[PDB]
Design a protein around this ligand. Structure first.
Ligand code: HEA
Ligand SMILES: CCCCC/C=C\C/C=C/C/C=C\C/C=C\CCCC(=O)O[C@H](COC(=O)CCCCCCCCCCCCCCCCC)COP(=O)(O)OCCN
Ligand SMILES: CCCCCC/C=C\CCCCCCCCCC(=O)O[C@H](COC(=O)CCCCCCCCCCCCCCC)COP(=O)(O)OC[C@@H](O)CO
Ligand SMILES: CCCCCCCCCCO[C@@H]1O[C@H](CO)[C@@H](O[C@H]2O[C@H](CO)[C@@H](O)[C@H](O)[C@H]2O)[C@H](O)[C@H]1O
Ligand SMILES: CCCCCCCCCCO[C@@H]1O[C@H](CO)[C@@H](O[C@H]2O[C@H](CO)[C@@H](O)[C@H](O)[C@H]2O)[C@H](O)[C@H]1O
Ligand SMILES: C[C@H](CCC(=O)O)[C@H]1CC[C@H]2[C@@H]3[C@H](O)C[C@@H]4C[C@H](O)CC[C@]4(C)[C@H]3C[C@H](O)[C@]12C
Ligand SMILES: [C-]#N
Ligand code: CUA
Ligand SMILES: [Cu+2]
Ligand SMILES: [Mg+2]
Ligand code: NA
Ligand SMILES: [Zn+2]
Lengths: 514, 73, 58, 43, 105, 259, 79, 94, 144, 46, 227, 84, 49
């Protein structure tokens, strides 16, 4: 029974649970790697070794946080638990293929851990650029194990995208149009389209890297007429969509959280929110070379990519102001999930604005490959994607488990994390503007003050991560069972109780056309 | 004894919003003026003042005499 | 050839509680055991190979 | 949300135990490695 | 849309329906308090008399509480509304939340 | 009992065995490239084939033999197959991008010209044109097979599907011969790299598509398809047309324009 | 000779940040010219402008490698 | 040119596929493939909600093109009203 | 009174200031005296006593508005506990400085820094605003 | 078929909170420890 | 170079870097204004017991929410693109210098006249002279004439690197097989520092750039003495 | 385009069989004729050890590490030239 | 009836604040951390050459 249920699953809730457990374990790995980074940098000099061990840690930090924590938690975890419930469907379209999307991830993670154990690891950056990632400067198996880790993670997500798109298009009540599905369901559908189109291009590029390393091709090697910059285009054709994949399910969860704890039946401006997510998804495919403003592209290309990148602020601003307009007039419940979501609105806005700074190719000459970029993306990742994850986790934990968290502890956790992430990353703007490069294990002495403060901030975030584990233990230890949940008339995923039965919607909802 | 007067009872949230969005706008202007004066113009004037009578050869000779250069003793 | 789909429909709808991957009969169990043994054994072997590759040789 | 009182209440003493054990599970192994870094490098 | 007076009159008519049922009483009050306004005394008067016809003393008191709540920090609105309702309160024997001690935390 | 039309699938081991097969194939390629050994890779390829066989076997059991493919389920599988093909189009798009990047801006190492100095391309009017006629013809014959099936004509469905498969095999044999005869190799700089990786992934997809057609051929021999319900045939035909269209783009881009 | 060369002038054929082809073209032009001139009984001095430009723009290792490959018979540009 | 030998769905469909096919021929929708058409929704003329148990979830799209659906359990017994628009629904278990 | 997990699909009671009249009464079962009280409620409410009126309210509702809206001392616990855990973090940093970090480079020694500062001023590091602009070259001291 | 309800729809037991504490400690602690021990591994090599 | 506790950009040494400072000031004012407005509106939405929970019409307010940001973006893009095209303008250099990145140091070639080239390595911390800067000094500086337009050509002979000098507003990637061009013009004599700006392996942190800007006559004699 | 055929009254099985045997397979037969006609080995060119060809940055994982997967001795020189 | 925050909130606030300030002041000043503040107004420049 245990093996049938948990290794042979065809159930969207159990698979969602598996993803949440996997993502939480990955989050611990990713947190440890982040502390090793900040320990190396928290005083001038060398702690661990030279830049190879240092950038193996940096590279794994990024891959773990992106591919094994954020995407599994948002898409595999919250997506599998919530999407079928929110449309009244009895499971996903392909419930058995869904299970293989999950089980590809432990092997993917094993490959990544193997890459770091063999030889001297893959010290390449998560972008894996050649020639540093090629077979002369990174001889041996580490980069090939990284490539294969990405192949498996990509297959997992491509099949998952097929599943989500099919489920959301095909398995709604017959009276429900796409414009009657909740915003979180929209956010997952759009993320899935981005995954479907972008990951195959990454797969092509890293397969090219694999054959340059092992089959004597020369896609990226000038000696054979190849070009290192071609790899950068193929990687970033995926990589910019990827950051919208990391944030869009978060936007969906934020819409639901802000609506719920405002005591509203609906988000402000539903069709504008749909429009904004679609627009962001589309524009996110035509801007990738803003990751390449210093590689030597023609000026008119730089001007196009500056302008097209900046226009993404318009649909994103509609979402920010619509969240504010959802709060407006609300009966505000100051729950811990609401605190995460309010932190998200502000700190995501700050990070998105420094992204607009970076979109200016002229200024990006000085900011590129500096900590200003690191500050931008951790505002939108540690204070954006992660704040949406924590808000969603706190909000829906009682649904998934049937038990309540201690809200006072959860507010304490939010407070500690909020201090920690801002102490970590706010000073990195100063380090970037004053010219500290990325991917450095040590820095000129002038940069010492802000690196010391940033490292102290990272230890505060460690304390918050440790406290989160205790808080989850305390909830399962005390077993306070849920009774009543408000606002079920506009939050269908709660209407089958907490936790919902293994099979829900065996008899579908009744919705007439009218 | 006297009756209480009828107060405004409708649109209290909207009235509050209107008043404070206006206030936010006026402050935004006040801050933009402060910033152009305290930051942007300060910088333009610092660079223009610095270069207005700047003598690059005199600067070089000072540096050279301090011993900073490989190419100039 | 003759159309024997009806016979297969009877077999795979027999009310015996078997999951579809075993419902064909004892051959399914054998092929399942072979597949799972190769997968689990091969995975242990891959872990051994990691162990081996994680340390310098000579 | 409303909920039942805890079926298995976790007293303050019990929470102090769970919290201490949780923190030590993170801090002792990493602290052991970091304490012995020089032994690893200076070798 | 419609004038204030047209709005107030629709709501008075709603609660004045002689055979208004319990569901319609709750639907009306729970809808009304979603708007950006404190209901006019004449609306509250009609809702209280609907409570009387439904033999529901407790909901009459609750309606008085929600009037105070919808006024937010505008502390002058609730005493005004109670003042305007005192003939109805006296006629129907409705005690205010304050007279019942239900304003104590 | 359910009162929706969707398929609650029995708990299955094949997702786990497929995921483990992916671990064994990738760690196996690593062992082959770096530790001189094919053992893991061979186990992985074997478990992958076993997984694919039992998984799709079970889908046939669930549909032909158990009746779970209602119209709603079939419609989902149509979307699934279309989306899968789209992902495969984007995979090939990356290799076309690599080809055009390198050929439109030939670097000094190549002679600053395309084709590179020292490369003697195949004549696109010889076996490459023959291969084009072969796959185009097979798109006509698979369309005949589809209409025969819809019209309830068992014998001509089988004849047309056999001709389609024969043409897929002919393409594969011709392409294998061309690979052997080609005077340039995958190690002949970016010309050989783009040529063999792009046409090689295409050849793999011809083999996959031909296998899928063969599965359909034997299911047809066993009377699985009705004149109205035959999604596996439809999916194989869609995949086959995708393989044909990718070939036409390779022929125009790499063999003709790139010569 | 319309000299006083300081460095290679702006060349409208190569107006962008990537100057690889500017180095390459002037290297080819110099050696093409030198081939013509040595051949027909003429003076390589007429080729001098291309020589100065490619020597200004081209990395030493590129010139060195291209020279080696011309000596070996493996230079892939047409001269 | 043309011949036979391909089974039809009438001959060979089985299981749930066959149940759906046969019910559709009869104009019946036991597996909820179609959207029900609303009645006027008064207490006299409530929307009739079939169920194989004593409660079913209703979603009410109160007005055409609303994006918000209002969800609630409908129980066997007296008709219930959508909490947003008041339109009436009555369970018809079978 | 007692709410049960198996009741999740039934109309439920809630105290929310924006949903003043919930879907069910707080108390559904009535004792003999409570029944008699509901009968008396059908007569003039002027004849109900204050206590009877309170009892009717508390049969219908759980908490009053004032009760459901009350503030709490929870912020003291949250802020105080958060400061405790932030304080605990500094213990980790003290441990790290003591047992993990070795000496920092010799370039932070006071004499080194004094010489390096002079050399920065000699090469006029950031002479417009950032650094040497803050040095008075005429008076040979930091500007006031 | 399977157990339903709080504490039953998860692959780990919550029947005893102290056994649970141990399991959660091993689970989250092993993920957090792994990078430190890989760093140790890479340092001890060379 | 950067100095302790620095918050913003290194002081400008070139006219283009001064342009970038003023453009950054303009854009940061906008960033601060929008961030502060969002924080303020958040606090405004959260500080009243007044409620309005019925459906709200979105159409009118979304015109403001799209048109005002579009105007702001245009007000950023215009000066942004002006500077972009300025940086691209034809300028007629007096000198061309090449730099090749390597693991882990830079080489420099000045081959307009003579074949002058040399390697430039970080000074190890243990060998710094008193008052020299840890991780920033090199053994052989890139001596260049001040007040003159210089064409810098950048490439690599191994992996990617990137050649940066923040105070001149310069960062050009060093890509094998590719010759990237930038222009350099220092308004002042002095010493201007940069650091390798593309991850390049074990000693990426430890291959810095030091430009030494002096009068032409000193540059000429230094060049001759380096042959 | 309409190409130059006709029919479109009923695109059915009979029409697609007509296209298969009347257009598609004759085209294959023509191109097969054309191909097995220009076949026969063209003469291999002088070997020149161009550095952008015969790339070897890592030995191949088969054979002696120096032979491509479908190495044809007649037309594929090694980095050192044609095989004997 | 008084809850945990009524009974202990004041003490948690006071003790937490006191502990937090004390330990961060100690860490910042007593254990040899090099903050590398600006030399401006602080360092007397000394001859180096
Ligand atoms: C969740 C992740 C995430 C998200 C959502 C984003 C969102 C954005 N990012 Fe970012 N980014 C990263 C993660 C993310 N980014 C990462 C990881 C990197 C580094 C990659 C690597 O090199 O490793 C990076 C790097 C990166 C660069 C490359 C810089 C360089 O390397 O030199 C650029 C350049 O244009 C960029 C820009 C943007 C912009 C314009 C947005 C926009 O989508 C933001 C839009 C949001 C707003 C603007 C705020 C809300 C709007 C309003 C309140 C309306 C009014 C606003 C205005 C009028 C301006 N990002
Ligand atoms: C006949 C038509 C079809 C042919 C297919 C034959 C076998 C190849 C299998 C197909 C895989 C396709 C792409 C693999 C990449 C390269 C193979 C390209 C096609 C091919 O077969 O290329 C051959 C070289 O093969 C080599 O190196 C062979 C290398 C053998 C190892 C295969 C590659 C191993 C790595 C595979 C990585 C797969 C990554 C998958 C990513 C999926 C992501 C979602 C060409 O032979 P040659 O002697 O150089 O020149 C001919 C000279 N007379
Ligand atoms: C090297 C390693 C590569 C190994 C690949 C080897 C070959 C694989 C070839 C693919 C064979 C697929 C066989 C599928 C058989 C099951 C099937 O076709 O199942 C059908 C459903 O379709 C369905 O699931 C549709 C199922 C779609 C399958 C899609 C197949 C393509 C996948 C190939 C893998 C891609 C690899 C890409 C590498 C870059 C069953 O429904 P019907 O047909 O309507 O029947 C019911 C009627 O009888 C009722 O009257
Ligand atoms: C039940 C599920 C299935 C579980 C599968 C477990 C299989 C384990 C068998 C491994 O055998 C090893 O294989 C190595 C490589 O395969 C051999 O190395 C050899 O292999 C190379 C390849 O032929 C030679 O070239 C090398 O000299 C030599 O080291 C080596 O003798 C042997 O120890
Ligand atoms: C970034 C994540 C971690 C950052 C913060 C870690 C906080 C440290 C927690 C304590 O870790 C322990 O510290 C002891 C020292 O206090 C070490 O004992 C070591 O030192 C002792 C005292 O000198 C000896 O008694 C022991 O034998 C010797 O192992 C011990 O091994 C280690 O587990
Ligand atoms: C025996 C069988 C009749 C099928 C059935 O009615 O049972 C016939 C009908 C169609 C035949 C196939 C088709 O005519 C196409 C192929 C023609 C080749 O000449 C032989 C194999 C070939 C694949 C045939 C095998 C066999 O004779 C088939 C399959
Ligand atoms: C941003 N990417
Ligand atoms: Cu060179 Cu980094
Ligand atoms: Cu991007
Ligand atoms: Mg870079
Ligand atoms: Na360090
Ligand atoms: Zn309704």
């Amino acid at each position: 029974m245990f093996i049938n249920r948990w290794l042979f699953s065809t159930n969207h809730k159990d698979i969602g649970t598996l993803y949440l457990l996997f993502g939480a374990w990955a989050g611990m790995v990713g947190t440890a790697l982040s502390l090793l980074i900040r320990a190396e940098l928290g005083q001038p000099g060398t702690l661990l070794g030279d830049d190879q061990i240092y950038n193996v840690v940096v590279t794994a930090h990024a891959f773990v946080m992106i591919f094994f924590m954020v995407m599994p938690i948002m898409i595999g975890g919250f997506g599998n638990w919530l999407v079928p419930l929110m449309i009244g469907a009895p499971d996903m379209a392909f419930p058995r293929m869904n299970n293989m999307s999950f089980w590809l991830l432990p092997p993917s993670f094993l490959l990544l851990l193997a890459s770091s154990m063999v030889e001297a690891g893959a010290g390449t950056g998560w972008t894996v650029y050649p020639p540093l990632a090629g077979n002369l400067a990174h001889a041996g198996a580490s980069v090939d194990l990284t490539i294969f880790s990405l192949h498996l993670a990509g297959v997992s997500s491509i099949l998952g995208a097929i599943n989500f798109i099919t489920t959301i298009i095909n398995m709604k009540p017959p009276a429900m149009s796409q414009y009657q599905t909740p915003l979180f369901v929209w956010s997952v559908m759009i993320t899935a389209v981005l995954l479907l189109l972008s990951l195959p291009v990454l797969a092509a590029g890293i397969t090219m890297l694999l054959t340059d390393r092992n089959l004597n091709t020369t896609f990226f090697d000038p000696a054979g007429g190849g070009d290192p910059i071609l790899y950068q285009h193929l990687f970033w054709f995926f990589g910019h969509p990827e950051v919208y994949i990391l944030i869009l399910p978060g936007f969906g969860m934020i819409s639901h959280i802000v609506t719920y704890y405002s005591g509203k039946k609906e988000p402000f401006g539903y069709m504008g929110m749909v429009w904004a997510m679609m627009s962001i998804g589309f524009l996110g495919f035509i801007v990738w070379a803003h990751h390449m403003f210093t590689v030597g592209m023609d000026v008119d290309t730089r001007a196009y990519f500056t302008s097209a990148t900046m226009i993404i602020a318009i649909p994103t601003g509609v979402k920010v102001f619509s969240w504010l307009a959802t709060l407006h007039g609300g009966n505000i419940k100051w729950s811990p999930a609401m605190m995460w979501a309010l932190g998200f609105i502000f700190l995501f806005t700050v990070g998105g604005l420094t992204g607009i700074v970076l979109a200016n190719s002229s200024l990006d000459i000085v900011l590129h490959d500096t900590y200003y970029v690191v500050a931008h993306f951790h505002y939108v990742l540690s204070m954006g994607a992660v704040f949406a994850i924590m808000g969603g986790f706190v909000h829906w934990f009682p649904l998934f488990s049937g038990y309540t968290l201690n809200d006072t502890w959860a507010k304490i956790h939010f407070a500690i994390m909020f201090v920690g992430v801002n102490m970590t990353f706010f000073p990195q703007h100063f380090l970037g503007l004053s010219g500290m490069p990325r991917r450095y294990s040590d820095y000129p002495d002038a940069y010492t003050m802000w690196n010391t403060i940033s490292s102290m901030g990272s230890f505060i975030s460690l304390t918050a991560v440790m406290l989160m584990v205790f808080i989850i233990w305390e909830a399962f230890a005390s077993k306070r069972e849920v009774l009543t949940v408000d606002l079920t008339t506009t939050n269908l995923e709660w209407l089958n109780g907490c936790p919902p039965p293994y099979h829900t919607f065996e008899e579908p909802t009744y919705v007439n056309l009218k | 004894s006297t009756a209480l007067a009828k107060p405004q009872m409708r649109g209290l949230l909207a009235r509050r919003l209107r008043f404070h969005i206006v206030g936010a706008f006026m402050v935004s202007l006040g801050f933009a003026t402060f910033y152009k004066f305290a930051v942007a113009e300060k910088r333009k004037k610092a660079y223009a003042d610095f270069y207005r009578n700047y003598d690059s050869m005199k600067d070089f000779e000072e540096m050279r005499k301090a011993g900073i250069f490989q190419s100039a003793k | 050839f003759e159309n024997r789909v009806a016979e297969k429909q009877k077999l795979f709808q027999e009310d015996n509680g078997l999951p579809v991957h075993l419902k064909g009969g004892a051959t399914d169990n054998i092929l399942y055991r072979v597949t799972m043994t190769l997968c689990l054994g091969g995975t242990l072997y891959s872990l051994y190979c990691l162990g081996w590759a994680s340390f310098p040789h000579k | 949300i409303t909920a039942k009182p805890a079926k298995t209440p976790t007293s303050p003493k019990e929470q102090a135990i769970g919290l201490s054990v949780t923190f030590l599970s993170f801090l002792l192994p990493a602290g052991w490695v970091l304490y012995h870094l020089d032994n690893y490098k200076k070798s | 849309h419609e004038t204030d007076e047209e709005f107030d009159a629709r709501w008075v008519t709603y609660f004045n329906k002689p055979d208004i049922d319990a569901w319609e009483l709750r639907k009306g009050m729970n809808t009304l308090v979603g708007y950006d306004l404190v209901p006019e005394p004449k609306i509250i008067d009609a809702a209280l008399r609907a409570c009387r016809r439904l033999n529901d003393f407790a909901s009459a008191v609750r309606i008085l509480e929600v009037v105070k709540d919808k006024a937010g920090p505008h502390k002058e609105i609730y005493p005004y509304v109670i003042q305007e309702l005192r003939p109805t309160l006296n006629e129907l024997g409705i005690s205010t939340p304050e007279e019942l001690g239900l304003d104590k935390v | 009992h359910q009162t929706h039309a969707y398929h609650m699938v029995n708990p299955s081991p094949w997702p786990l065995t497929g995921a483990l097969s992916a671990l064994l194939m990738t760690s196996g390629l690593t062992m082959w490239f770096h530790f001189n050994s094919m053992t893991l890779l061979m186990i992985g390829l074997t478990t992958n084939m076993l997984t694919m066989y039992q998984w799709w076997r079970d889908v046939i059991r669930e549909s032909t033999f158990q009746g779970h493919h209602t119209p709603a389920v079939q419609k989902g599988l149509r979307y699934g197959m279309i989306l899968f093909i789209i992902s495969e189009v984007l995979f090939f798009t990356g290799f076309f991008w690599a080809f055009y990047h390198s050929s439109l801006a030939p670097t000094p190492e190549l002679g600053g010209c395309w084709p590179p100095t020292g490369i003697h391309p195949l004549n696109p009017l010889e076996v490459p044109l023959l291969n084009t006629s072969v796959l185009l013809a097979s798109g006509v014959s698979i369309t005949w097979a589809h209409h025969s099936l819809m019209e309830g004509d068992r014998k001509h469905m089988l004849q047309a599907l056999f001709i389609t498969i024969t043409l897929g095999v002919y393409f594969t044999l011709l392409q294998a011969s061309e690979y052997y005869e080609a005077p340039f190799t995958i190690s002949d700089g970016v010309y050989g790299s783009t040529f063999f990786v792009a046409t090689g992934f295409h050849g793999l997809h011809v083999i996959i598509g031909s296998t899928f057609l063969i599965v359909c051929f034997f299911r047809q021999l066993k009377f699985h398809f009705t004149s109205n319900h035959h999604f596996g045939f439809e999916a194989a035909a869609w995949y086959w047309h995708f393989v044909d269209v990718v070939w036409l783009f390779l022929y125009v881009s790499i063999y003709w324009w790139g010569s | 000779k319309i000299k006083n060369y300081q460095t290679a002038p702006f060349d409208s054929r190569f107006p962008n940040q990537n100057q690889t082809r500017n180095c390459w073209q002037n290297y080819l032009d110099f050696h093409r010219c030198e081939k013509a001139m040595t051949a027909k009984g003429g003076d390589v001095s007429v080729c001098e402008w291309y020589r100065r430009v490619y020597k200004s723009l081209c990395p030493i290792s590129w010139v060195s490698t291209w020279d080696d490959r011309r000596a070996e018979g493996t230079f892939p540009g047409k001269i | 040119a043309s011949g036979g030998g391909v089974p039809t769905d009438e001959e060979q469909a089985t299981g749930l596929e066959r149940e759906v096919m046969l019910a559709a021929r009869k104009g019946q929708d036991p597996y909820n493939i179609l959207a029900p058409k609303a009645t006027s929704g008064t207490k006299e003329d409530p929307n009739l909600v079939p169920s194989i148990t004593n409660k079913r979830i209703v979603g009410c799209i109160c007005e055409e093109d609303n994006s918000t659906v209002i969800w609630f359990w409908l129980h066997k017994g007296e008709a219930q009203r959508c909490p947003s628009c008041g339109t009436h629904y009555k369970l018809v278990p079978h | 009174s007692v709410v049960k997990s198996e009741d999740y699909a039934l109309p439920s009671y809630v105290d929310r200031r924006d949903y003043p009249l919930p879907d069910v009464a707080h108390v559904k079962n009535l004792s003999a005296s409570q029944k008699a009280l509901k009968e008396k409620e059908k007569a003039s409410w002027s004849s109900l006593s204050i206590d009877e009126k309170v009892e009717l309210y508390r049969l219908k509702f759980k908490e009053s508005f004032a009760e459901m809206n009350r503030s709490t001392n929870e912020w003291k616990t949250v802020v105080g506990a958060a400061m405790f855990f932030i304080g605990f973090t500094a213990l980790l940093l003290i441990w790290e400085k003591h047992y993990v970090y070795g000496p920092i480079p010799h370039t932070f020694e006071e004499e080194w820094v004094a010489k390096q500062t002079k050399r920065m001023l000699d090469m006029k590091v950031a002479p417009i605003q950032g650094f040497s602009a803050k040095w008075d070259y005429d008076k040979n001291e930091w500007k006031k | 078929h399977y157990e339903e309800g709080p504490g039953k729809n998860i692959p780990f037991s919550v029947e005893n909170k102290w056994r649970l504490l141990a399991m959660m400690t091993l689970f989250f602690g092993s993920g957090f420890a792994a990078p430190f021990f890989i760093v140790r591994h890479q340092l001890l090599k060379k | 170079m950067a100095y302790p506790m620095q918050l913003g950009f290194q002081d400008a040494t070139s006219p283009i870097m001064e342009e970038l400072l003023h453009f950054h000031d303009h854009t940061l004012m906008i960033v601060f204004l929008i961030s502060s407005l969002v924080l303020y509106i958040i606090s405004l939405m959260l500080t009243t017991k007044l409620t309005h929970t019925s459906t709200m019409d979105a159409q009118e307010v979304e015109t403001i929410w799209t048109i005002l940001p579009a105007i702001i973006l245009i007000l950023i893009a215009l000066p942004s693109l002006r500077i972009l095209y300025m940086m691209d303008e034809i300028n007629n250099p007096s000198l061309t210098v090449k730099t090749m990145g390597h693991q882990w140091y830079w080489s420099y070639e000045y081959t307009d006249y003579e074949d002058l080239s040399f390697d430039s390595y970080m000074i190890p911390t243990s060998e710094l002279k008193p008052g020299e800067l840890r991780l920033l000094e090199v053994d052989n500086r890139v001596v260049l004439p001040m007040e003159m337009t210089i064409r810098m050509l950048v490439s690599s002979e191994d992996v990617l690197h990137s050649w940066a000098v923040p105070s001149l507003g310069l960062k050009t990637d060093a890509i094998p097989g590719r010759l990237n061009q930038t222009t350099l013009m220092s308004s002042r004599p002095g010493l201007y520092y940069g650091q390798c700006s593309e991850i390049c392996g074990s000693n990426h942190s430890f291959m810095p750039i030091v430009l030494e800007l002096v009068p032409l006559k000193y540059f000429e004699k230094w060049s001759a003495s380096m042959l | 385009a309409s190409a130059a055929k006709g029919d479109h009254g009923g695109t059915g099985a009979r029409t697609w069989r007509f296209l298969t045997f009347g257009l598609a397979l004759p085209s294959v037969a023509l191109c097969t004729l054309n191909s097995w006609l220009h076949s026969g080995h063209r003469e291999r060119p002088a070997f020149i050890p161009y550095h952008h060809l015969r790339i070897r940055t890592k030995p191949f994982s088969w054979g002696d590490g120096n032979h491509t997967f479908f190495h044809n001795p007649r037309v594929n020189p090694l980095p050192t030239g044609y095989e004997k | 009836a008084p809850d945990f925050h009524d009974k202990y909130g004041n003490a948690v606030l006071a003790s937490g604040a006191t502990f937090c300030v004390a330990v961060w002041v100690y860490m910042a000043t007593q254990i040899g951390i090099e903050w590398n503040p600006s030399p401006v107004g602080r360092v007397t420049p000394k001859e180096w050459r």
